Structure 1
Amino acid sequence: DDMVIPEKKHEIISEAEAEVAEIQEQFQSGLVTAGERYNKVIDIWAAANDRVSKAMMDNLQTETVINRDGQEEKQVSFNSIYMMADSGARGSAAQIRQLAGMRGLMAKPDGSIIETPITANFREGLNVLQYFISTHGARKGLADTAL
């Protein structure tokens, strides 16, 4: 439960999907070239990743809404994983994002980027396709370190 999921996440994800559909219709109309739609879909997916990470961080940073001697107030959360990341003892913001927010756009078969990113974090499950996709980067990094 320490990996608080932003409840708006799917919403913006759905929005992204809708936009993708629209550009596909544009690509069906013939007024958009393959490179243009490819770059635009990568850009919109990156924007969705940035906004979902920002929403999760906003939710997880000042999570504690604790009362005071008068009325109620809010402060920096005592979330154990957030305390781990913020204190600098272990972890970073990117690992936080991979834990709670979307995994992000990733690909390393030849250095390119797959159009459809991994929209599922580690708190939720990963499909077979998403795990097989992440294995590319995992093996690339491990082999790079080994040599």
Structure 2
Amino acid sequence: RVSKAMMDNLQTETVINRDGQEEKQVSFNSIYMMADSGARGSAAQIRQLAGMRGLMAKPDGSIIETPITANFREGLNVLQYFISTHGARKGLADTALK
């Protein structure tokens, strides 16, 4: 729900226009342009940047009860960062092994 709200607000907030009326159009936010053009980025990374970081997992493959409710614009606390380091180091070992 917060990812859908973030995508809508980022996608169509550019409304203040003229010459027919004030009307909705596609937003010229640069993060959204880099995502929507397929240049560099995707909606999951835009969700981590602006919406919610999401549910992280324990190293035994189990999802934790509480998720990281912060994002990288607001910054994480120490517990959320230590929770994210498990998946970070797991993926960085899996790249070498693969």
Q: Distance in 1 between matches of 2:76 and 2:60?
A: 23
Name structure 1 gaps, 5 residues minimum.
Answer: 1-50
CA distance in 2 between partners of 1:71 and 1:85 (Å):
28
Q: Deviations over 1:114-139 (max 9, x none)?
A: 10100000000101000000000000
What does the per-residue CA deviation read over 1:85-117, in whole Å, with 9 as the maximum and x for residues that have no partner?
Answer: 000010101000000011000113100011010
Distance 2:35 2:17 in 1: 25
State TM-score, norm by structure 2: 0.95
Ranges in structure 2 where 5+ consecutive residues have no aligned partner: none
Residues paired across the two proteins, number: 97
Q: Secondary structure at the match of 1:109?
A: coil
> In 2, are the aligned partners of 1:108 and 1:140 still within 8 Å (CA)?
no
- Alpha-carbon shift at residue 70 of structure 1 (Å): 3.2
Structure 1 length-normalised TM: 0.64
Distance 2:9 2:25 in 1: 12
Is 1:74–2:27 an aligned residue pair?
Answer: no
Q: What SS does the aligned partner of 2:10 have?
A: helix
Q: Distance in 2 between matches of 1:60 and 1:101?
A: 10
Larger radius of gyration: 1
**Cα distance between partner residues in 2 of 1:120 and 1:67:** 33
